[PDB]
Amino acid sequence: PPTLPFHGESAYRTDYVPKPLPEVAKPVEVKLPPTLPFNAQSCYRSEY
């Protein structure tokens, strides 16, 4: 009589094979605006 090969694998083996690592390099920056120059004025030093 003939014999068959072993065709059957474990449920952990068939699914839990390793998985591709995600793309974890997406850095972003901010847009902090510059400060407008000082043009405010004191009333004493503007009048007197």
């Binding site: 090969p5 065709h7 694998e9 068939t14 699914d15 094979v17 390793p18 998985k19 591709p20 995600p22 793309e23």
Partner: protein
Amino acid sequence: PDVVKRTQQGNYVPVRPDHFAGVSVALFFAKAGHSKCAQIVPVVRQFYKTTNFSGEKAVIEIIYVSLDKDEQDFERVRALMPWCSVEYKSCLRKKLIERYRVPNTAIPLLIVIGPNGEEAGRMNFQQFVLQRWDYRFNKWP
């Protein structure tokens, strides 16, 4: 290198590697003579034609790694497949089918891969599953 042919009817020129430049990639293990393979081949051709070229970017692409028992089997199915395929005169045939372990039952089996030689999903055609590709993670960046 000198492996995986594209589509090119008449001369069958292979593929320089950056054809796969942002497409979802899978391995479609199949073999003619297997009756279950026979009705999955035209419907995966249908998936290869509406979610691929009906609109924008070619977003899917598959490789036919053959498990054919003779060479005359190979050119009949590969002339039928408009997607890419590996040849019989190649060491890439056996190393893929034993890394993913289709016994030589399994046919047909689709396994999406990544840019690592690493699986990203098991399909289980053999017994309507085609619309679960998730071709947004499957990208080969």
